[PDB]
Design a protein around this ligand. Structure first.
Ligand SMILES: C[C@@H](c1cccc2c(-c3ccc(CS(C)(=O)=O)c(F)c3)c(C(=O)O)[nH]c12)n1cc(CCC2(N)CC2)oc1=O
Ligand SMILES: [Zn+2]
Ligand SMILES: [Zn+2]
Length: 232
């Protein structure tokens, strides 16, 4: 009823939207993995009379439910989606999107890693993001490659109209006690990559992590802190 929805508030298979700013929503879904249930976030950005989606809802059924929730709450068509790295919480559901008329995009590195790992593969490659500090425009957002962090391919998304920074899985929520799923992470480079984000987006007003509650710029420093302590 107004607060950001939490893992225990969302059954696996339902999706909720949360209004972040004018023309900006997050999407929240839950999924089971190795016998535990986790929430995960994505983003929706109004693009005139169309919508840009950032990340799937972590699975085919969750992503179908996401499209239904968008039609109920917003009523504009999703025409493009970007996946911010290759894991299933970002690309799982790309096949559902592709069958619902959505053009799916990711960096070449994400596409190669998704294919090698057996995950769903976005159709279109996003060039111009291969060196850390690179940024490109994509409709109403900027895409930014900060360097290796949670994964070597992770991208960040900024909505300049609203000063919303979507960190994806490179950014953790304030309550986090470790660096999440570090299976594909570079703990040594991650603080440097977060510092690049901090330097590039000093006017961010909302920061959204890949999992958990949005907050402000403090999420970036907290992420650096928990990553350094995890490595140690
Ligand atoms: C889907 C994702 C995934 C599945 C299940 C859980 C997660 C988390 C996560 C865990 C704990 C917390 C609480 S916390 C920060 O307080 O610890 C959190 F916020 C996020 C994150 C993340 O951290 O992005 N990803 C998750 N996945 C799966 C793999 C396997 C890769 C591989 N080569 C095959 C071995 O690698 C991933 O990433
Ligand atoms: Zn991941
Ligand atoms: Zn993640």
């Amino acid at each position: 009823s107004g607060e950001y929805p939490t893992v225990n508030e969302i059954p696996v298979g339902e999706v909720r939207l949360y209004q972040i700013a004018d023309g900006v929503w997050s999407h929240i879904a839950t999924q089971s993995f190795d016998g535990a249930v986790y929430p995960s976030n994505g983003l929706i950005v109004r693009d005139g009379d169309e919508l840009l989606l950032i990340d799937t809802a972590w699975g085919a059924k969750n992503t179908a439910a996401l499209l239904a929730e968008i039609e109920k709450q917003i009523g504009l068509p999703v025409t493009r989606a970007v996946s911010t790295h290759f894991h299933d919480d970002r690309v799982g559901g790309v096949d559902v999107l592709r069958a619902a008329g959505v053009a799916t995009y990711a960096s070449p590195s994400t596409r190669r890693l998704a294919e090698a790992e057996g995950n769903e593969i976005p159709t279109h490659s996003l060039e111009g993001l291969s060196s850390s500090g690179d940024a490109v425009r994509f409709g109403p957002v900027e895409l930014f490659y900060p360097g290796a962090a949670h994964s070597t391919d992770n991208l960040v998304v900024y909505v300049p109209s609203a000063n919303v920074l979507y960190g994806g899985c490179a950014v953790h929520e304030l309550s986090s006690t470790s660096a999440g799923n570090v299976a594909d992470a570079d703990l040594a480079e991650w603080p440097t990559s977060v510092e690049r984000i901090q330097k590039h987006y000093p006017e961010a007003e909302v920061v959204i992590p890949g999992h958990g509650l949005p907050g402000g710029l403090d999420l970036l420093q907290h992420t650096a802190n928990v990553v350094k302590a995890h490595k140690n």
